[PDB]
Write a protein that holds these residues in place. Structure first.
Motif, PDB file in Angstrom:
ATOM      1  N   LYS A  83       0.803  -1.216   0.000  1.00  0.00           N
ATOM      2  CA  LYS A  83       0.000   0.000   0.000  1.00  0.00           C
ATOM      3  C   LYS A  83       0.836   1.265   0.000  1.00  0.00           C
ATOM      4  O   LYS A  83       0.495   2.222  -0.699  1.00  0.00           O
ATOM      5  CB  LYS A  83      -0.944   0.013   1.207  1.00  0.00           C
ATOM      6  CG  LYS A  83      -1.923   1.173   1.209  1.00  0.00           C
ATOM      7  CD  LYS A  83      -2.820   1.132  -0.014  1.00  0.00           C
ATOM      8  CE  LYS A  83      -3.726  -0.086   0.005  1.00  0.00           C
ATOM      9  NZ  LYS A  83      -4.759   0.007   1.072  1.00  0.00           N
ATOM     10  N   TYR A 119      -0.419   9.770   4.989  1.00  0.00           N
ATOM     11  CA  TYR A 119      -0.051   8.853   3.921  1.00  0.00           C
ATOM     12  C   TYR A 119      -1.250   8.640   3.008  1.00  0.00           C
ATOM     13  O   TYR A 119      -2.401   8.882   3.386  1.00  0.00           O
ATOM     14  CB  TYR A 119       0.466   7.519   4.469  1.00  0.00           C
ATOM     15  CG  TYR A 119      -0.587   6.629   5.082  1.00  0.00           C
ATOM     16  CD1 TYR A 119      -1.188   6.957   6.288  1.00  0.00           C
ATOM     17  CD2 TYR A 119      -0.963   5.449   4.466  1.00  0.00           C
ATOM     18  CE1 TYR A 119      -2.143   6.138   6.852  1.00  0.00           C
ATOM     19  CE2 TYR A 119      -1.915   4.626   5.022  1.00  0.00           C
ATOM     20  CZ  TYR A 119      -2.501   4.976   6.216  1.00  0.00           C
ATOM     21  OH  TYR A 119      -3.452   4.157   6.773  1.00  0.00           O
ATOM     22  N   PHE A 122      -5.279   5.849  -1.814  1.00  0.00           N
ATOM     23  CA  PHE A 122      -6.106   5.724  -3.007  1.00  0.00           C
ATOM     24  C   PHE A 122      -5.430   6.436  -4.168  1.00  0.00           C
ATOM     25  O   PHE A 122      -5.051   7.604  -4.042  1.00  0.00           O
ATOM     26  CB  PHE A 122      -7.502   6.311  -2.776  1.00  0.00           C
ATOM     27  CG  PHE A 122      -8.368   5.483  -1.874  1.00  0.00           C
ATOM     28  CD1 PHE A 122      -8.575   4.142  -2.129  1.00  0.00           C
ATOM     29  CD2 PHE A 122      -8.975   6.049  -0.768  1.00  0.00           C
ATOM     30  CE1 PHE A 122      -9.367   3.382  -1.301  1.00  0.00           C
ATOM     31  CE2 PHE A 122      -9.769   5.292   0.063  1.00  0.00           C
ATOM     32  CZ  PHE A 122      -9.965   3.958  -0.204  1.00  0.00           C
ATOM     33  N   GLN A 159      -4.765  10.043   4.682  1.00  0.00           N
ATOM     34  CA  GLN A 159      -5.179   9.668   6.026  1.00  0.00           C
ATOM     35  C   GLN A 159      -3.986   9.776   6.965  1.00  0.00           C
ATOM     36  O   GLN A 159      -2.845   9.949   6.535  1.00  0.00           O
ATOM     37  CB  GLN A 159      -5.780   8.261   6.066  1.00  0.00           C
ATOM     38  CG  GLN A 159      -6.842   8.103   7.140  1.00  0.00           C
ATOM     39  CD  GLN A 159      -7.501   6.746   7.124  1.00  0.00           C
ATOM     40  OE1 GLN A 159      -7.187   5.899   6.288  1.00  0.00           O
ATOM     41  NE2 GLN A 159      -8.426   6.530   8.049  1.00  0.00           N
TER      42      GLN A 159
ATOM     43  N   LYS B  13     -11.545   2.118   3.853  1.00  0.00           N
ATOM     44  CA  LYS B  13     -11.678   3.289   4.713  1.00  0.00           C
ATOM     45  C   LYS B  13     -12.259   2.916   6.074  1.00  0.00           C
ATOM     46  O   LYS B  13     -11.828   3.445   7.118  1.00  0.00           O
ATOM     47  CB  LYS B  13     -12.553   4.334   4.023  1.00  0.00           C
ATOM     48  CG  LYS B  13     -12.755   5.616   4.804  1.00  0.00           C
ATOM     49  CD  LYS B  13     -11.505   6.472   4.804  1.00  0.00           C
ATOM     50  CE  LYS B  13     -11.737   7.767   5.560  1.00  0.00           C
ATOM     51  NZ  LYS B  13     -12.752   8.621   4.888  1.00  0.00           N
TER      52      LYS B  13
END
Ligand SMILES: *[C@@H]1O[C@H](CO)[C@@H](O)[C@H](O)[C@H]1NC(C)=O
Ligand SMILES: [Zn+2]
Lengths: 194, 588
Positions: A83, A119, A122, A159, B13
Motif C-alpha cells: 500500500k 499517507y 487511493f 489519512q 476506509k
C-alpha cells in the motif's frame, strides 16, 4: 565533511508522500560511523558490499527521509508491493543503495496521540519509480462525478497515523532514510579518506 | 463500477477509521476498570457513545451493496458482518418501550430482597447449610419475591422481541440466536441453522447412559444426609442440589465422596514455603507456552498489565479478565495471590491472550473466534493440562518419589464430573424451553406446567411445592433476566474434550486420557496454531477439521475421558435402581 547529522538527527521529518529529498556531493563521507553505530534496527544494502563502501566511490548521493509504521518497513525493498510501496514511495529493481531504519517512539508519540503524519491510500495508477505526488484531488470511484464534496463512492485520498505510546511493536513509528548512489559520466567528487 | 471493487474501497476506509475509534474506546474503558472515580465514567460514556454512533451510521450506509452479487467470500463475509450489526431497528416508539422494559427487568433482579440480599448471603446459605427447612424457605422466598414480579414483563418481552425478529427477515428470535452457527462455503462445509436443533439432541442421547448412573450415585448418597425425606426411586428435590438453581453440583463433594480419608493434591503450603510471588506464576505460565511452539509475550504486557491489587488507596474490581485493546496491546488484569486456583486461572487467561494474538493479522471485522464456543474451549484445555501431577512433579512443586493411588484418580474424576457432566442437561432443557416459547409451540397459559414436565422428564428434579401459572421460575436465572445466549456452554463442553483428545493423540501419549500433558511437544502446538491463526475468515467447520479431523460435534472423547469413573460406578450400582419415574411428589 558533508553533514550526515543534518538529516540523521534532524528534529523534524517529513510524511511518506511528501518525502524529503537531499543531494550530497563535494564532501568526504566516513561510513564507519554508521554501520557500526550499534543503535539501528535495519541496515540493508543492495548492490554494494557494506564493508567495501570505503574504497570505491561515486559522484552524487541522494538521501530520502521519511517516517512510517513498523510492519511496513519490509515494503521498502526492490520488487515489493503493498500500500505504501505502490502509492507513496517506489524503488526500482536495479537499486544500488542502502536502507536504514530505526525506532523513534520516544519522539513521535504523544499521550493524546500524534496525528500530523499523513499517507496516501487511493490512487488511479501505480507510481513510476522515484516519483512524488502531493495533489489533493478527490478520488473518483463510482460513475457519478463528485465535485468539491465527498459523498457516496467518493473519498479524500490522505489519512493519518495514530501514533500513541502504549502501542505494540508493529504499530510504533519508525524513521527511515534511503541512500541512493549515482555514477554518471561526471567525475567523482565524494568518498572516504586515504 | 463492479460492486466488488466498491465494497473493497468502502471497507478499506472503514477499517482504518475503526482501528482508531475502537482503540480510544477500549483505553477509556480500561481507565475506568482500573481506577474507579467519578470523572472516569464521563470519559468512558463519551467514548462509547461516539463509537456507537459511528458504527450505527456506517452500518446504515453499508446496506446499499447487495450480499448476493458479491462473489469473493472474504468481502461477502465482511459485508454480512457489518450489515447485520446495528440492524436492530424497527421504530423509535417501540424501541424506547423495549429498552425501558429491559432496564426495569434488569434492575429488579439486582436489588431484590427476601432481609437478606442474594449475592452475599443467599449464595452462602444455599452452598453451605444442611437443613431442609432453611433451604426450602430460601428457595420459595426467592422464587416468590422476584419470580412473581416478572411474569407480565416477560410476557410483553417475548412478543415485543418476536416482532423485532420478524421485521429483520428472520423467522423468530430463536432463529436469530441460532444464526451464529450458520456457515457458507464449499460443498461439505455448509451448516444451516435449522440443523442445529437436531444435532444437539443427538449428542444428548449419548450422554444419558453416563449421567443416569451419576444421578443414582448421588441419590443413594443423600439417603444418609436426610433420613426419610427423599424417595428411594424418584427424582431428587430441587433445593438440595447445592445451588439456588441446580446449575452446578460442585457443593455436594463433601457428602458425595468415595474415600474421605485420602486428601487431594494441594500445593499452596509448598508454594508459600518455597517463597513464590505473583510474577513467578506468570513466568511459569509463559514457560509452559514457550515449550509447545507458541510466541512469548510482548514487552508491553509486563509494563502495562495489572497483576496485583494496588495498595495506594485506589479502588479496583480486579475480576480476572484478559484484554485485547487492539494496535498490538494485550493485557491481563487479575488480583493475584499465592494459591493454586490462581495458578490455573493464570493459564486460562494466558490461553485467551495467545488466541487473541494468533489472528492479529486478519482484517478488523474478522478478529473473533470461529464460533462463540471456541474461545473458552481453547483456554480450558490449558488448565486441564497444567493441573496434572506430572507437570507439577516436573516443575518442582512435588517430590519425585510421589505416586498416584487409584483412589486419587477416582476422587479427582468425581470432582470433575460433578462440574462438567451435571451442567449439561440443565443447559439443554433451559435452551429448549426458551426456543419453544419463542417459536410459539407452548401457548401463553401453559408455561410452568411444561417447564416442570420437562424438568421431570429430562433432568430428573421434582419441585417441593405446587406452582401455578402466576409464578415464573426460568426468569429467576441471571442469564434470562438479562438477555443472553446459553448454548455456548453446551458447545464448549464437547469442543474442549474433542480438542484434548486430538492434541493428546498427536502428542504420542499412552494410557488414560486424564493423565495427559502437552508440555515439550511442538507438533501439538503447531496443530493448534494452524487453527488459532485462522480466525473468523473461514467457516467453523473447516477450523474444526484442522485440529480434530471431523466436521461436526462428536461426543466420544467426552465419554472416553470418564471411562474409569463409569467402570467404577457400574460396580457400586448393582444393589440399587438406576433411573427415575415421574409419578412421585414430595408434597403428596
Ligand atoms: C546525529 O546525532 C547522533 C546522536 O548522538 C550522533 O551520533 C551524531 O551527532 C549524529 N549521527 C551520526 C550518525 O553522525
Ligand atoms: Zn476464560
Amino acid at each position: 565533511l558533508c553533514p550526515f547529522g543534518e538529516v540523521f538527527n534532524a528534529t523534524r521529518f517529513a510524511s511518506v508522500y511528501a518525502w524529503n529529498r537531499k543531494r550530497i556531493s563535494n564532501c568526504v563521507a566516513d561510513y564507519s560511523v554508521l554501520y557500526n553505530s550499534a543503535s539501528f534496527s535495519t541496515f540493508k544494502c543492495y548492490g554494494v558490499s557494506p564493508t567495501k563502501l570505503n574504497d570505491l566511490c561515486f559522484t552524487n548521493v541522494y538521501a530520502d527521509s521519511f517516517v512510517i509504521r513498523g510492519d511496513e518497513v519490509r515494503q521498502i525493498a526492490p520488487g515489493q508491493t503493498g500500500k505504501i510501496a505502490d502509492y507513496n514511495y517506489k524503488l526500482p529493481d536495479d537499486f544500488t543503495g542502502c536502507v536504514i531504519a530505526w525506532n523513534s517512539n520516544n519522539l513521535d508519540s504523544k499521550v493524546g496521540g500524534n496525528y500530523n503524519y499523513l499517507y496516501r491510500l487511493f490512487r488511479k495508477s501505480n507510481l513510476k519509480p522515484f516519483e512524488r505526488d502531493i495533489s489533493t484531488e478527490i478520488y473518483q470511484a463510482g460513475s457519478t462525478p463528485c465535485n468539491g464534496v465527498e459523498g457516496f463512492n467518493c473519498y479524500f485520498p490522505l489519512q493519518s497515523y495514530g501514533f500513541q505510546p502504549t502501542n505494540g511493536v508493529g504499530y510504533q513509528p519508525y524513521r527511515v532514510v534511503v541512500l541512493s548512489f549515482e555514477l554518471l559520466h561526471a567525475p567523482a567528487t565524494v568518498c572516504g579518506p586515504k | 463500477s463492479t460492486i466488488e471493487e466498491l465494497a473493497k474501497t468502502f471497507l478499506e476506509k472503514f477499517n482504518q477509521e475503526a482501528e482508531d475509534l475502537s482503540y480510544q474506546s477500549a483505553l477509556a474503558s480500561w481507565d475506568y476498570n482500573t481506577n474507579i472515580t467519578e470523572e472516569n465514567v464521563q470519559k468512558m460514556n463519551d467514548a462509547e457513545a461516539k463509537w456507537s454512533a459511528f458504527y450505527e451510521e456506517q452500518s446504515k450506509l453499508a446496506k446499499t451493496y447487495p450480499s448476493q452479487e458479491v462473489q469473493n467470500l472474504t468481502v461477502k463475509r465482511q459485508l454480512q458482518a457489518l450489515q447485520q450489526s446495528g440492524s436492530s431497528a424497527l421504530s423509535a416508539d417501540k424501541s424506547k418501550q423495549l429498552n425501558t422494559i429491559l432496564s426495569t427487568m434488569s434492575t429488579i433482579y439486582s436489588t431484590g430482597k427476601v432481609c437478606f440480599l442474594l449475592e452475599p448471603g443467599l449464595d452462602e446459605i444455599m452452598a453451605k447449610s444442611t437443613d431442609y427447612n432453611e433451604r426450602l424457605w430460601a428457595w420459595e422466598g426467592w422464587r416468590s419475591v422476584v419470580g412473581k414480579q416478572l411474569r407480565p414483563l416477560y410476557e410483553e418481552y417475548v412478543v415485543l422481541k418476536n416482532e423485532m425478529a420478524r421485521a429483520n427477515n428472520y423467522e423468530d428470535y430463536g432463529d436469530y440466536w441460532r444464526a451464529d452457527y450458520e456457515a457458507e462455503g464449499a460443498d461439505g462445509y455448509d451448516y444451516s441453522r435449522s440443523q442445529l436443533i437436531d444435532d444437539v439432541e443427538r449428542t444428548f442421547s449419548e450422554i444419558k447412559p453416563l449421567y443416569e448412573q451419576l444421578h443414582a450415585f448421588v441419590r443413594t448418597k443423600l439417603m444418609d444426609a436426610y433420613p426419610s425425606r427423599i424417595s428411594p426411586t424418584g427424582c431428587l428435590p430441587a433445593h438440595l442440589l447445592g445451588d439456588m438453581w441446580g446449575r452446578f453440583w460442585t457443593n455436594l463433594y463433601s457428602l458425595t465422596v468415595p474415600f474421605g480419608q485420602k486428601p487431594n493434591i494441594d500445593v499452596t503450603d509448598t508454594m508459600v514455603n518455597q517463597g513464590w510471588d505473583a510474577e513467578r506464576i506468570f513466568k511459569e505460565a509463559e514457560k509452559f507456552f514457550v515449550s509447545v511452539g507458541l510466541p512469548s509475550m510482548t514487552q508491553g504486557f509486563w509494563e502495562n498489565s495489572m497483576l496485583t491489587e494496588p495498595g495506594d488507596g485506589r479502588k479496583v474490581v480486579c475480576h480476572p479478565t484478559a484484554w485485547d485493546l487492539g494496535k498490538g496491546d494485550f493485557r491481563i488484569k487479575m488480583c493475584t495471590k499465592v494459591t493454586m486456583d490462581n495458578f490455573l486461572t493464570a493459564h486460562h487467561e494466558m490461553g485467551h491472550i495467545q488466541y487473541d494474538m494468533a489472528y492479529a493479522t486478519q482484517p478488523f471485522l474478522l478478529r473473533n473466534g470461529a464460533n462463540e464456543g471456541f474461545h473458552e474451549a481453547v483456554g480450558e484445555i490449558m488448565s486441564l493440562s497444567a493441573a496434572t501431577p506430572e507437570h507439577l512433579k516436573s516443575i518442582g512443586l512435588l517430590p519425585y518419589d510421589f505416586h498416584e493411588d487409584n483412589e486419587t484418580e477416582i476422587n479427582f474424576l468425581l470432582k470433575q464430573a460433578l462440574t462438567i457432566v451435571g451442567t449439561l442437561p440443565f443447559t439443554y432443557m433451559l435452551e429448549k424451553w426458551r426456543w419453544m416459547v419463542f417459536k410459539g409451540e407452548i401457548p401463553k397459559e401453559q408455561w410452568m406446567q411444561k417447564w416442570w414436565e420437562m424438568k421431570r422428564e429430562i433432568v430428573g428434579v421434582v419441585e417441593p411445592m405446587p406452582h401455578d401459572e402466576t409464578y415464573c421460575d426460568p426468569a429467576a436465572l441471571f442469564h434470562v433476566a438479562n438477555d443472553y445466549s446459553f448454548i455456548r456452554y453446551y458447545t464448549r463442553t464437547i469442543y474442549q474434550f474433542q480438542f484434548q483428545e486430538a492434541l493428546c493423540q498427536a502428542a504420542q501419549h499412552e494410557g488414560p486420557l486424564h493423565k495427559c500433558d502437552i508440555s515439550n511437544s511442538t507438533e501439538a502446538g503447531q496443530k493448534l496454531l494452524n487453527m488459532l491463526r485462522l480466525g473468523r475468515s473461514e467457516p467453523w467447520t473447516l477450523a474444526l477439521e484442522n485440529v480434530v479431523g471431523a466436521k461436526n460435534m462428536d461426543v466420544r472423547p467426552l465419554l472416553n475421558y470418564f471411562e474409569p469413573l463409569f467402570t467404577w460406578l457400574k460396580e457400586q450400582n448393582r444393589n440399587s435402581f438406576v433411573g427415575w419415574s415421574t409419578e412421585w411428589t414430595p408434597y403428596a
